[PDB]
């Protein structure tokens, strides 16, 4: 960001287009690109879209929810943010969002299968159609986002399909495609944190014993931004994660202690020891009775699997960015949910973390 | 004079038939109209060089400072003749009989601030004249006399 994102004013894409950026990088400036951000209306998209538009890149955001795309237009200027109605089952609408696009970003990825899509149909079927269709329109660069633990042979549906999503893209878009693996990001209304703040978290012991490498969502938002303007980063695999290792159960008590939540945790439902069959049965029952995406069977297995760093991939420093730690930002993102306010600074998170580990 | 006026002299929707006599029995003031305009008359047909120059002769901009101010009392006037020349010394040594005609008016009496309009003279009016509130109401009506 700073004042101007582009490294050089004139950039030539892989397709021979010669794009000249104008202006000093303000709202009324431009960069001559057209970055189609699939799944832009999601949690991750609203950061990817926001950074691209403010610096003058045209953003084509294909949406399926009409009332969620309205707020994305504030970020850009007049004509900067464009909208296309689409569904992954409508091939023609896909080709409307890639015809004029020089950058194509893929963010579509689900954890719960619905009555219209399975986990494979989205992490693969959407990705395969999106990647292959983009190539036929002469898209210069493709960027993809997968799980942080992609594995073709994993028994977890999410990790198995996300891994195959990496293969099927590279057999469709080709060598130019890029794959970026984000660690669980934390931000306002982050799905990673929304499970920790929920008071009635059945199976809290089982769900929160998993391990992670939390990463600030803004940096990943800029991580795609750095990759977008550069052609040197084609055909790579990137895994983005935070230095200091944290576990959900370590966070859950750390989160609760900041909110100061005697008898209350024992009664309101903070700790709900429930049998393993009951958790498996409850998730299956809601899967046919619920109407909103609930806790899934897949996240019962993932809770037993810890995050794995892959050494074949490249870190933040490969892009010149130093990742930020959850300690410097965990307090502010739960500040909404918390005499004299005690602000738990960066260093003081350890002293909180110390208080959790002490029996 | 804006006295009371009947309903049939106001361009408004009226009452036709016995309803007129019903209206004149129930309504507190029978000479008030409903306010709806007359559709048959109101908006019925729709709307479908030097001798004459003064700006160049605008009054000039002349400033009078202490130097020129002193000159009127000593030399006199361009109608009735009689560098840094300070006024304060002139007021210290000059004939008061110059003051009582030049610097002051009507035998040294101070000049009342010039009225922006002399003919602003007021008189207090009464209820039977202006048809406004009676006396107990806490206002009074003034006129130009």
């Amino acid at each position: 960001v700073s004042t101007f994102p582009l490294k050089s004013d004139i950039n030539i894409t892989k397709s021979g287009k010669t794009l000249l950026s104008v202006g000093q990088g303000g709202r009324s400036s431009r960069t001559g690109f057209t970055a189609t951000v699939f799944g832009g209306t999601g949690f991750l998209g609203r950061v990817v879209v926001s950074k691209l538009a403010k610096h003058g890149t045209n953003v084509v955001v294909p949406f399926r929810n009409d009332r969620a795309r309205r707020q994305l237009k504030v970020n850009g200027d007049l004509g900067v943010v464009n909208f296309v109605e689409f569904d992954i089952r409508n091939l023609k609408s896909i080709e409307d969002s890639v015809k004029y696009s020089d950058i194509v970003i893929n963010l579509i990825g689900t954890e719960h299968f619905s009555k219209n899509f399975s986990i494979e149909d989205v992490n693969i079927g959407a990705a395969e159609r999106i990647a292959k269709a983009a190539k036929e329109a002469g898209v210069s660069r493709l960027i993809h986002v997968s799980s942080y633990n992609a594995n073709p042979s994993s028994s977890s549906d999410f990790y198995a399909t996300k891994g195959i999503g990496e293969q099927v893209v590279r057999d469709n878009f080709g060598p130019d495609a890029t794959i970026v693996r984000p660690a669980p990001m934390y931000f306002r209304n982050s799905p990673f944190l929304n499970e920790l703040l929920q008071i009635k978290a059945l199976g809290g012991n089982v769900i929160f014993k998993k391990e992670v490498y939390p990463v600030h969502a803004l940096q990943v938002g800029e991580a795609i931004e750095r990759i977008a303007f550069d052609d040197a980063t084609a055909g790579q695999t990137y895994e983005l994660f935070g230095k200091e290792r944290y576990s959900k159960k370590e966070l859950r008590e750390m989160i609760k202690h900041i909110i100061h939540i005697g008898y209350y945790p024992y009664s309101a439902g903070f700790y709900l020891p429930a049998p393993e069959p009951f958790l498996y049965a409850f998730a299956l029952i809601r899967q046919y009775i619920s109407s909103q995406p609930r806790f899934n069977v897949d996240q019962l297995k993932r809770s037993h699997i810890n995050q794995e760093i892959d050494q074949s991939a490249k870190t933040f420093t490969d892009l010149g960015m130093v990742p930020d730690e959850l300690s410097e930002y965990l307090y502010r993102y739960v500040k909404p949910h918390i005499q004299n306010r005690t602000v738990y600074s960066k260093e003081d998170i350890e002293k909180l973390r110390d208080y959790v580990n002490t029996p | 004079s804006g006295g009371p006026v009947p309903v049939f002299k106001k361009y408004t929707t009226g009452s036709k038939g016995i309803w007129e006599k019903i209206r004149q029995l129930l309504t507190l003031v029978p000479n008030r109209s409903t306010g709806n305009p007359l559709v048959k008359n109101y908006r019925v047909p729709p709307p479908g060089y030097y001798d004459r120059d003064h700006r160049r002769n605008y009054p000039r901009l002349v400033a009078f400072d202490q130097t020129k101010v002193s000159g009127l009392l000593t030399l006199g006037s361009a109608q009735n003749p009689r560098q840094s020349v300070s006024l304060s010394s002139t007021l210290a040594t000059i004939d008061p009989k110059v003051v009582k005609s030049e610097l002051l008016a009507e035998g040294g009496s101070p000049v009342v601030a010039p009225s922006l309009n002399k003919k602003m003279k007021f008189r207090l009016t009464e209820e039977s004249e202006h048809g406004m509130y009676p006396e107990d109401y806490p206002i009074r009506i003034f006129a130009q006399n």
Binding site: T34, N58, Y100 | -
Partner: protein, 124 residues
């Protein structure tokens, strides 16, 4: 055909079509100004992807509706007076000297004139 659509011309070699949405106007293909951006180029933008081209504003080109109009003629005089041909809601009155031997357009309306003698010569 990617050649006349992006070039300015006096007239059009091909006969235009009202139903071609790539032309500059329904009644003319090539643009009538050197700096005017061809319509085919403009519609190749990001914001025309899902917007229907049929409903976009395509007013008929001005440079044709005038040249359809037959040239006015003047008999036994060499000064042409034109003031909009509509009364007092027109352009300011202008006098056109007819000494030159061709069709001289009006200042504002674009109407062309002639003389009695040169009626046969100018029409050639």
């Amino acid at each position: 055909s990617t050649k006349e659509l992006t070039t300015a011309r006096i007239k059009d070699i091909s006969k235009p079509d009202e139903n071609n949405l790539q032309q500059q106007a329904p009644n003319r293909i090539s643009p009538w100004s050197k700096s005017q951006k061809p319509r085919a180029e403009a519609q190749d933008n990001v914001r025309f992807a899902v917007k229907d081209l049929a409903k976009q504003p395509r007013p008929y080109a001005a440079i044709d509706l005038i040249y359809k109009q037959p040239i006015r003629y003047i008999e036994h005089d060499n000064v042409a007076v034109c003031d909009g041909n509509g009364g007092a809601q027109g352009h300011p009155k202008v006098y056109i000297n007819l000494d030159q031997n061709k069709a001289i357009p009006c200042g504002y309306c674009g109407l062309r004139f002639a003389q009695a003698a040169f009626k046969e010569d100018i029409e050639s």
